[PDB]
Ligand binder design. Structure first.
Ligand SMILES: O=C(O)[C@H]1NCCc2c(O)noc21
Ligand SMILES: O=C(O)[C@H]1NCCc2c(O)noc21
Ligand SMILES: [Zn+2]
Ligand SMILES: [Zn+2]
Ligand SMILES: [Zn+2]
Lengths: 259, 261
């Protein structure tokens, strides 16, 4: 049986190729997670189909219906066999799905438009002229909803009440908002994507400050699925052989246009 | 069914250390450190009584190539002497094949410790020369990293290290540090960034971590394969990390206690 692999369009993990229109199936896509899947699949010995998660989300639970969306939902409700994406290992998710050991480390970070007088979360939290938000339906937004350390609680309180909404549907949307808001909008997102964007034309954004936390991405499977075991072992072997570090260099820095 | 959980661990600063007055204290109270703090938390959130015990042979764990027997903290779990290990125990493939690991509670990488002023900036630097000697911990993941590496700079360093005389390998982290301090810059030490960074904050303040990490990995809390504890422990680590506890603990034992301004 072919493995249904759910993933999301997010750079530089999974992207459509320049010439995608003439390509078919898995060949249409390229990127870090695209290579990883091939590798995972090779060492685990399976054929698989890359499909793009329908609602374009990572996954969260509707507090009312208790229904999961995003890639989490596709796994939980049986639509997909495995998620290969920049999906953050968290407690509420681990309660309903399986994660492999982290294939990549990262932290919540701040993106600014160059020249923006912000150096920290502290800075953001003690001012009002510059708006800031996060990705909706992701681990980052949950972070602030659950974090009552002084600075963060203050920020969440501002964000959860802010108007018009500081929250965004995708990273691209968040990133475009920073770029067009003449420095009046900052964007909270994971260091991996932040660092990546900093190295792309128009080269007008930067990561300022350090990460707010430490965590990781895991390959996810439905609870107690037969693939979880081998997948997990594969990730370890891949990390140990330098392949992961190799892919990260290939997709981040070898592919960087801000010299 | 009320069983005190036997916790195997290792004496490694600042993870687990003897209290100055341990001679007058009993049980768990004899000890202090990051992993001592962690152990108390994990047991509280998993609802169990536990006894801290120092690993008998003082090692992390490797499989003897001849006898095929596992030593160190890993062996303790494999052969049933202990119920759980809570230490700076690196998650690796060969270990994961024989025991269970939680999701990582701390991140790290192989790094270079030098005596200050030692003309070394990188691994490539070590490999390109011979005046300065360098070694790793025995029976650890770092050594195995090099013995297995297929990348040029690392195979070079390995083939040098494995044949070098006298041996550039040490029995304990402390032995490696002292050797750096006493070797006038003629010896450099390969170890994980977490320990490197700790030691750089201690008197006499004569060492430093140079370069970037060679790799990226994690410490995990280990249980015997199939043990019932694994699930809760794993869930506990994820919550403690999200509630910020792990971040606090690293502050407490590394930086709030720095002797080097
Ligand atoms: O939800 C997730 O899996 C996280 N990884 C993707 C990027 C992200 C984000 O912007 N907020 O939370 C996350
Ligand atoms: O083996 C291990 O679990 C690693 N963590 C402890 C310190 C260490 C070391 O010096 N080499 O490898 C390791
Ligand atoms: Zn391969
Ligand atoms: Zn003593
Ligand atoms: Zn607690």
């Amino acid at each position: 049986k072919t493995v249904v692999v759910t993933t999301i369009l997010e750079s530089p993990y999974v992207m459509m190729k320049k010439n995608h229109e003439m390509l078919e199936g898995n060949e249409r896509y390229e990127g870090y997670c695209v290579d990883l899947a091939a590798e995972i699949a090779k060492h685990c010995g399976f054929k698989y189909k890359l499909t793009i998660v329908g609602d374009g989300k990572y996954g969260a639970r509707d507090a009312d219906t208790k229904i999961w969306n995003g890639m989490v939902g596709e796994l939980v409700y049986g639509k997909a066999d495995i998620a290969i994406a920049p999906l953050t290992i968290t407690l509420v998710r681990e309660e309903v799905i399986d994660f492999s050991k982290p294939f990549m480390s990262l932290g919540i970070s701040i993106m600014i438009k160059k020249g923006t007088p912000i150096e920290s979360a502290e800075d953001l939290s003690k001012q009002t002229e510059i708006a800031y938000g996060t990705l909706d339906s992701g681990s980052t937004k949950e972070f602030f909803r659950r974090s009552k350390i002084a600075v963060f609680d203050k920020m969440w309180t501002y964000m959860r009440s802010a108007e018009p909404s500081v929250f965004v549907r995708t990273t691209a949307e968040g990133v475009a908002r920073v770029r067009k808001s003449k420095g009046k909008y900052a964007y909270l997102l994971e260091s991996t994507m932040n660092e990546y964007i900093e190295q792309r034309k128009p080269c007008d954004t930067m990561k300022v400050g350090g990460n707010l936390d430490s965590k990781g991405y895991g390959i996810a499977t439905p609870k107690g699925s037969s693939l979880g075991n081998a997948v997990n072992l594969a990730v370890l072997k891949l990390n140990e052989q330098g392949l992961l570090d190799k892919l990260k260099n290939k997709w981040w820095y070898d592919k960087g246009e801000c010299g």
